[PDB]
Design a protein around this ligand. Structure first.
Ligand SMILES: Nc1ncnc2c1ncn2[C@@H]1O[C@H](COP(=O)(O)OP(=O)(O)OP(=O)(O)O)[C@@H](O)[C@H]1O
Ligand SMILES: [Mg+2]
Ligand SMILES: [Mg+2]
Lengths: 151, 486, 187, 81, 105
């Protein structure tokens, strides 16, 4: 109910104006209806311009109708797109991940398909073979700063 | 320079199958071609299951794996103090190689029955609640259990910082060298921790073993044992150490992944059959020796992060069964204003009174009894105006003491100042002051006593008890200050 | 029933049948005979005709074992080899035969003392130094051995030589040298 | 269900200690109706306590069932290889 | 042959382990000799796992399974309105055929 995408777009535009930083929106395992709604609401809010090169956000979308491998590795794609900006232009990027819940359940499905780890361990945010090795890439390097906002 | 070797049948997830190595030992350190080390955990008729202490991207199939001939060991010594190392001792602070000359195994056995003596000397943390109601001793294993973001790391940092007064001091028998094993924590938080321990000049005597979240599961599994060996060095050579595993739940998770990838039969909650063995052989090495062996000590403060107070889980139950007590933190206390959010009823110390100086014992018996009397009736509040006056005084004094237990961050109080303020709190002197001013009081009063009455605190610290002389002087100072406090 | 284990062990069903035949031959002294007849029966079972017939999953077990017994009995097999064949057949392990044979071959590769050792260098060597090197790496051996040299060439090590003799492994190549140099000058 | 059992048991604990507070308050105001309120709230607290014991039995039963079920899941997922 | 046709290695509980069928695709609908169709779900190195679209009584070990090249497909259109059909689009309301000119995967 509460206007949230407006707050995300405001954070994007404000970090892009005040500072010189861009933003990456990861859409890991999310409803394509909501994803299209956000894409349009951003187009008609100036954050994205289809007829310019002054857009303030890059989008990475992994939909729910895609295999667990997709929805698991689609969090790292946006992370890498923001890692470039950070470690190549010194910006303070703003990386959104629509859900960590989706990412961890996708990783749990991935490890259930390989049938090597019981389905009671899921994805462990501390192990480097799961979410940890991802969540630690989002820090304050002495070359820049990624920051992750997670609905 | 010929070394017995093997090939890599398979690599990945931190688990390398190695064909050959017909003379490798169980728990032996192997060395790959990329420079990475590893531990041979599974010895099977046709191959060896090795865990790699690094990333598995530097090894491919057919890669040569050399032996080393040694059980996994890490360098120990005083050359570690002030450094930040990984689970294997290799310095990651970028300040040159560790100039240590001796190494110690990570899987040594704990001392037996004979080399031990009872826990008697206190291990001052600086937190009023901990040092008063849930005391700790030297050679004790005091668990710190709680939810996420409740102030466990903070209690460990305060305990590490507090020993500055004894380390910079002159006494050699009251010096306590700290060790902070970090397991499964972001590198940024370890950086905050090291800058905070160097801002307080505490890194001068502290070791940090960091096995972060991006570190391989074998590294997070090994880190506590490397830290405990570094501490066991001091413990066996006559000095007094203290080790904080923050935390053991994530070391258990790393061991669980390792065991599942080594094809070992899972147990409850998918943990291996011997995770109790893991944690108990880690924790029983925290002992207190006798004078015939050196009189050393090694206090362990294992940390456990539960999920919604679930101390009836597997790993919390194990670590509670192994330790000598617990310090239960809460999110409800953390929100209702108590910080440090220590739960006094659930927390316990099985050594307890044996690990206190006489002054803190004198005041803490009365404090703990009155706090029990407060909690047994604490639900009766919000209608106190309609109940017995003695129970109303119990409720009021209880609120007074509970707010006497709050404390700011990175400010560990000396023991004599602790007993001073708790004295001024339990003798009824605050039943006149309303609760919203107890913090103002405690602050101003403690500043007054440390500024104008240094000799009193010096004598109380040199004796450790509140003698009736110092008792009368406390009457004096408390009443004269309180008479003037706004 | 006591069994005599070979000096090296192979595992799986391959190694189990290999060591079974090794003991069954060393108990009546026919290692060489069963070995050569094994390699020849492996050649026989790999001719496309019976090589195709033998894996077809519906051919009856009794009919196929009798067909294979007919085909093997004409080469004048000793009873041990045809016993192994009939066991692998009525146990349905025929597709593994050659593998087993390979194992058994390598089995004998240790009975004669044949130690396989690799000496890999940048570019192919000329056999004067290769012969003196045969002498050099035959020097470490004990009483009663024979060696098998299998040298391969790779310029990726850009010099030196690597001697992987059994499990012993010396890496005198300049690659490991320069890696040591770098790790030392950085540390 | 473990969590719904905790829900109902916390509800009953709430009203139990509520009647405890109200009993001790009405016993304070006892220095006719107030004495009746005291005894009635005493009986209500003892009733809620016996219900808490029943719910604790049921909770322990459900906890054992949950642990056994998760173990069966783990071992049957591991034994399929 | 054993590239466009296979031979049932095993049958049971509605699962047929079919030998051969080398050129079969995943999730493709093959046809047994008894008229019953099946969907090849497991493509294993040694056999194919076919889920049978019917009763496994009519299928015997050793039967012939033929590729059809047709992945599952159902009729569509307005002609399907008012008709009760089964999971594969065959009318089961006993009102004749369905004049569906359009199919869809
Ligand atoms: N005694 C205190 N008084 C006031 N605030 C405190 C106190 N201790 C900690 N805090 C604050 O509460 C926050 C969380 O504390 P802390 O990180 O130590 O708990 P934690 O459980 O170890 O964290 P994590 O769950 O990440 O491991 C910190 O920001 C800290 O500043
Ligand atoms: Mg979430
Ligand atoms: Mg913490």
């Amino acid at each position: 109910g509460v206007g949230k995408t407006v707050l995300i777009m405001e954070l994007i535009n404000n970090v892009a104006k005040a500072h010189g930083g861009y933003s990456v929106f990861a859409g890991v395992g999310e409803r394509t209806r909501e994803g299209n709604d956000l894409y349009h609401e951003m187009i008609e809010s100036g954050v994205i311009n289809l007829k310019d090169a002054t857009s303030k956000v890059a989008l990475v979308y992994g939909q729910m109708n895609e295999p667990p491998g997709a929805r698991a590795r689609v969090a790292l794609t946006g992370l890498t797109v923001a890692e470039y900006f950070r470690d190549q232009e010194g910006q303070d990027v703003l990386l959104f991940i629509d859900n960590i819940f989706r990412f961890t359940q996708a990783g749990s499905e991935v490890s259930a398909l390989l049938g090597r780890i019981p389905s009671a361990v899921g994805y462990q945010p501390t192990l480097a073979t799961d979410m940890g090795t991802m969540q630690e890439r989002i820090t304050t390097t002495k070359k820049g700063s990624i920051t992750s906002v997670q609905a | 320079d010929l070394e017995e070797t093997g090939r890599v049948l398979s690599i990945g997830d931190g688990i390398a199958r190695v064909h050959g190595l017909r003379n490798v030992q169980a728990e032996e350190m192997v060395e790959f071609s990329s420079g990475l080390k590893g531990m041979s955990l599974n010895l099977e008729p046709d191959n060896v299951g090795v865990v790699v202490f690094g990333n598995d991207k530097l090894i491919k199939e057919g890669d040569i794996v050399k032996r080393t001939g040694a059980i996994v060991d890490v360098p120990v010594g005083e050359e570690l103090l002030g450094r930040v190392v990984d689970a294997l001792g290799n310095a990651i602070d970028g300040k040159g190689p560790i100039g240590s000359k001796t190494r110690r195994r990570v899987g040594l056995k704990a001392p037996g029955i004979i080399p031990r003596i009872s826990v008697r000397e206190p291990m001052q943390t600086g937190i009023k609640a901990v040092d008063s109601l849930v005391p700790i001793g030297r050679g004790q294993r005091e668990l710190i259990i709680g939810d996420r973001q409740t102030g466990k790391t903070s209690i460990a940092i305060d305990t590490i910082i507090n020993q500055k007064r004894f380390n910079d001091g002159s006494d050699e028998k009251k010096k306590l060298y700290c060790i902070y094993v970090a397991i499964g924590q972001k590198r940024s938080t370890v950086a905050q921790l090291v800058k905070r321990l160097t801002d307080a000049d505490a890194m001068k005597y502290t070791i940090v073993v960091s096995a972060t979240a991006s570190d391989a599961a074998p590294l997070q599994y090994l880190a506590p044992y490397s830290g405990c060996s570094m501490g066991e060095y001091f413990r066996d050579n006559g000095k007094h150490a203290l080790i904080i595993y923050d935390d053991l739940s994530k070391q258990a998770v790393a061991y669980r992944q390792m065991s599942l990838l080594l094809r070992r039969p899972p147990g409850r909650e998918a943990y291996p059959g011997d995770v109790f063995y893991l944690h108990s052989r880690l924790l029983e090495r925290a002992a207190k020796m006798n004078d015939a062996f050196g009189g050393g000590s090694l206090t362990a403060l294992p940390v456990i992060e539960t999920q919604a107070g679930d101390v009836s889980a597997y790993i919390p139950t194990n670590v509670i069964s192994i330790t000598d007590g617990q310090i239960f933190l809460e999110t409800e206390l953390f929100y209702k204003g108590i910080r440090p959010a220590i739960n006094v009823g659930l927390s316990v110390s099985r050594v307890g009174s044996a690990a206190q100086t006489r002054a803190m014992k004198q005041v803490a018996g009365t404090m703990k009894l009155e706090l029990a009397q407060y909690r047994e009736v604490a639900a009766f509040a919000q209608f106190g105006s309609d109940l017995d006056a003695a129970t109303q005084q119990l409720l009021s004094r209880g609120v007074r003491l509970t707010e006497l237990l709050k404390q700011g961050q990175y400010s560990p109080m000396a023991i004599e100042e602790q007993v001073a303020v708790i004295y001024a709190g339990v003798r009824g002197y605050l039943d006149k002051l309303e609760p919203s001013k107890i913090t103002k009081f405690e602050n101003a009063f403690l500043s007054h006593v440390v500024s104008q009455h240094q000799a009193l605190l010096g004598t109380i610290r040199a004796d450790g008890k509140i003698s009736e002389q110092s008792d009368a002087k406390l009457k004096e100072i408390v009443t004269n200050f309180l008479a003037g406090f706004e | 029933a006591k069994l005599v284990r070979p000096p090296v062990q192979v595992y799986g069903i391959e190694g189990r049948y290999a060591t079974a035949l090794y003991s069954a031959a060393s108990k009546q002294n026919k290692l060489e005979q069963v070995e050569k007849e094994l390699l020849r029966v492996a050649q026989i079972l790999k001719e496309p005709k019976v090589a195709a017939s033998v894996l077809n999953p519906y051919v009856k077990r009794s009919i196929k074992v009798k067909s294979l017994n007919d085909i093997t009995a004409k080469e004048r097999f000793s009873p041990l080899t045809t016993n192994l064949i009939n066991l692998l057949a009525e146990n349905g392990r025929l597709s593994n035969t050659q593998g087993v044979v390979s194992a058994f071959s390598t089995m004998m590769s240790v009975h004669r003392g044949e130690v396989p050792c690799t000496v890999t260098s940048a570019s192919p060597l000329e056999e004067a130094t290769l012969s003196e090197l045969k002498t050099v790496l035959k020097s470490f051996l004990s009483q009663g051995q024979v060696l098998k040299l299998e040298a391969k060439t790779d310029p990726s090590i850009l010099g030196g030589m690597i001697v992987r003799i059994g499990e012993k492994y010396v890496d005198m190549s300049v690659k490991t040298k320069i890696q040591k140099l770098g790790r030392a000058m950085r540390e | 269900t473990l969590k719904d059992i905790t829900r109902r048991l916390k509800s009953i604990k709430n009203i139990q200690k509520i009647t405890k507070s109200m009993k001790m308050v009405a016993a304070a105001k006892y220095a006719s109706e107030q004495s009746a309120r005291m005894t009635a709230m005493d009986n209500a607290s003892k009733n809620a306590s016996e219900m808490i014991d029943k719910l604790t039995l049921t909770f322990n039963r459900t906890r054992q069932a949950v642990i056994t079920k998760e173990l069966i899941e783990i071992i049957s997922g591991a034994a399929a290889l």
